Motif scaffolding. Structure first.
Motif, PDB file in Angstrom:
ATOM      1  N   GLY A   1       0.830  -1.228   0.000  1.00 33.46           N
ATOM      2  CA  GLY A   1       0.000   0.000   0.000  1.00 33.46           C
ATOM      3  C   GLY A   1       0.847   1.254   0.000  1.00 33.46           C
ATOM      4  O   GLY A   1       1.964   1.255   0.517  1.00 33.46           O
ATOM      5  N   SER A   2       0.329   2.317  -0.597  1.00 33.26           N
ATOM      6  CA  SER A   2       1.031   3.590  -0.650  1.00 33.26           C
ATOM      7  C   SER A   2       0.035   4.743  -0.706  1.00 33.26           C
ATOM      8  O   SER A   2      -0.545   5.015  -1.759  1.00 33.26           O
ATOM      9  CB  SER A   2       1.959   3.636  -1.868  1.00 33.26           C
ATOM     10  N   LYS A   3      -0.168   5.391   0.442  1.00 35.57           N
ATOM     11  CA  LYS A   3      -1.061   6.548   0.563  1.00 35.57           C
ATOM     12  C   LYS A   3      -2.531   6.154   0.446  1.00 35.57           C
ATOM     13  O   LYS A   3      -2.922   5.375  -0.430  1.00 35.57           O
ATOM     14  CB  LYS A   3      -0.734   7.617  -0.483  1.00 35.57           C
ATOM     15  N   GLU A   4      -3.344   6.702   1.335  1.00 35.39           N
ATOM     16  CA  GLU A   4      -4.781   6.500   1.282  1.00 35.39           C
ATOM     17  C   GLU A   4      -5.396   7.535   0.351  1.00 35.39           C
ATOM     18  O   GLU A   4      -5.074   8.721   0.435  1.00 35.39           O
ATOM     19  CB  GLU A   4      -5.381   6.614   2.685  1.00 35.39           C
ATOM     20  N   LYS A   5      -6.260   7.088  -0.549  1.00 34.38           N
ATOM     21  CA  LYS A   5      -6.851   7.977  -1.540  1.00 34.38           C
ATOM     22  C   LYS A   5      -8.165   8.566  -1.029  1.00 34.38           C
ATOM     23  O   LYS A   5      -9.151   7.847  -0.852  1.00 34.38           O
ATOM     24  CB  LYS A   5      -7.072   7.245  -2.870  1.00 34.38           C
ATOM     25  N   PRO A   6      -8.180   9.884  -0.763  1.00 32.08           N
ATOM     26  CA  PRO A   6      -9.365  10.591  -0.259  1.00 32.08           C
ATOM     27  C   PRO A   6     -10.474  10.699  -1.309  1.00 32.08           C
ATOM     28  O   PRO A   6     -10.214  10.695  -2.515  1.00 32.08           O
ATOM     29  CB  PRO A   6      -8.834  11.986   0.104  1.00 32.08           C
ATOM     30  N   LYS A   7     -11.706  10.811  -0.826  1.00 28.47           N
ATOM     31  CA  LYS A   7     -12.894  10.822  -1.677  1.00 28.47           C
ATOM     32  C   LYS A   7     -12.994  12.104  -2.504  1.00 28.47           C
ATOM     33  O   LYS A   7     -12.484  13.152  -2.105  1.00 28.47           O
ATOM     34  CB  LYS A   7     -14.149  10.674  -0.811  1.00 28.47           C
ATOM     35  N   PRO A   8     -13.648  12.026  -3.672  1.00 25.21           N
ATOM     36  CA  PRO A   8     -13.907  13.184  -4.515  1.00 25.21           C
ATOM     37  C   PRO A   8     -15.220  13.882  -4.148  1.00 25.21           C
ATOM     38  O   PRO A   8     -16.274  13.246  -4.058  1.00 25.21           O
ATOM     39  CB  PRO A   8     -13.990  12.575  -5.911  1.00 25.21           C
ATOM     40  N   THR A   9     -15.143  15.186  -3.928  1.00 26.27           N
ATOM     41  CA  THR A   9     -16.308  15.976  -3.555  1.00 26.27           C
ATOM     42  C   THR A   9     -16.451  17.186  -4.485  1.00 26.27           C
ATOM     43  O   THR A   9     -15.564  17.430  -5.303  1.00 26.27           O
ATOM     44  CB  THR A   9     -16.187  16.451  -2.091  1.00 26.27           C
ATOM     45  N   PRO A  10     -17.562  17.946  -4.412  1.00 26.28           N
ATOM     46  CA  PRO A  10     -17.718  19.166  -5.214  1.00 26.28           C
ATOM     47  C   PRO A  10     -16.562  20.142  -5.013  1.00 26.28           C
ATOM     48  O   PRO A  10     -16.084  20.750  -5.967  1.00 26.28           O
ATOM     49  CB  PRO A  10     -19.028  19.766  -4.709  1.00 26.28           C
TER      50      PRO A  10
END
Lengths: 52, 52
Positions: B1-10
């Protein structure tokens, strides 16, 4: 639909490695582009994982 | 694993819209960053599709 998304290859990654470095050498980059940095951190990350 | 991918928002998208424009106003951008452009064309594209 909007634009077809092309596959990630080593060529994609070798260029990413230099892009991520070029931006890191630019103290102006951080101010001019907001999401562009993180998109390398994800793309470079996912391209390395989807590596065949 | 490498970095947690944050969610896409407006918020992600509204900033992307200005980033994609800022780079388009830079004739030097095309030379300094290779994949950064396409990553907006995909991210902006996918953020708009995953819109809730």
């Amino acid at each position: 639909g909007s634009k077809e998304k092309p596959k990630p290859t080593p060529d994609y990654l070798m260029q990413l490695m230099n892009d991520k470095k070029l931006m890191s050498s630019l103290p102006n980059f951080s101010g001019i582009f907001t999401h562009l940095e993180r998109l390398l951190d994800e793309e470079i990350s996912r391209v390395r994982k989807d590596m065949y």
